[PDB]
Design a protein around this ligand. Structure first.
Ligand SMILES: *[C@@H]1O[C@H](CO)[C@@H](O)[C@H](O)[C@H]1O[C@@H]1O[C@@H](C)[C@H](O)[C@@H](O)[C@H]1O
Ligand SMILES: *[C@@H]1O[C@H](CO)[C@@H](O)[C@H](O)[C@H]1O[C@@H]1O[C@@H](C)[C@H](O)[C@@H](O)[C@H]1O
Ligand SMILES: *[C@@H]1O[C@H](CO)[C@@H](O)[C@H](O)[C@H]1O[C@@H]1O[C@@H](C)[C@H](O)[C@@H](O)[C@H]1O
Ligand SMILES: *[C@@H]1O[C@H](CO)[C@@H](O)[C@H](O)[C@H]1O[C@@H]1O[C@@H](C)[C@H](O)[C@@H](O)[C@H]1O
Ligand SMILES: *[C@H]1C[C@](C)(N)[C@@H](O)[C@H](C)O1
Ligand SMILES: *[C@H]1C[C@](C)(N)[C@@H](O)[C@H](C)O1
Ligand SMILES: *[C@H]1C[C@](C)(N)[C@@H](O)[C@H](C)O1
Ligand SMILES: *[C@H]1C[C@](C)(N)[C@@H](O)[C@H](C)O1
Ligand SMILES: [Cl-]
Ligand SMILES: [Cl-]
Ligand SMILES: [Cl-]
Ligand SMILES: [Cl-]
Lengths: 7, 7, 7, 7
């Protein structure tokens, strides 16, 4: 919720 | 991106 | 109780 | 989300 990714 | 929060 | 998650 | 509180 505010960071990015992608996982 | 797939976890939650809130920050 | 006021934060989020998910655990 | 699974803990309690109260905050
Ligand atoms: C996750 O939180 C953001 C930021 O507030 C919100 O815009 C999204 O709609 C929210 O996603 C929902 O809630 C999560 C907990 C559910 O897993 C997701 O499927 C979506 O309903
Ligand atoms: C972030 O990534 C998700 C895919 O997991 C995608 O659904 C969103 O549209 C994407 O957010 C955009 O790109 C990020 C980099 C920007 O900060 C956000 O404002 C939105 O434009
Ligand atoms: C969690 O909170 C976000 C941001 O406020 C909201 O967009 C989501 O819908 C909310 O998730 C719901 O409520 C929580 C309590 C549940 O664990 C989740 O699965 C979803 O129903
Ligand atoms: C909080 O959790 C305890 C232990 O399970 C339960 O006995 C209480 O009913 C529960 O409180 C409710 O749910 C929480 C989320 C609300 O903040 C509280 O006001 C009460 O409705
Ligand atoms: C973001 C980019 C990635 C790491 N290559 C991909 O595997 C993931 C699903 O999305
Ligand atoms: C999620 C709930 C929170 C941690 N209490 C709030 O400060 C944040 C902006 O959103
Ligand atoms: C919230 C999202 C998560 C961390 N990917 C999931 O494992 C948990 C049960 O809910
Ligand atoms: C839960 C109980 C508490 C710590 N006394 C209160 O201050 C909070 C608002 O709710
Ligand atoms: Cl994120
Ligand atoms: Cl996330
Ligand atoms: Cl919480
Ligand atoms: Cl909780």
């Amino acid at each position: 919720x505010x960071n990015x990714x992608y996982x």
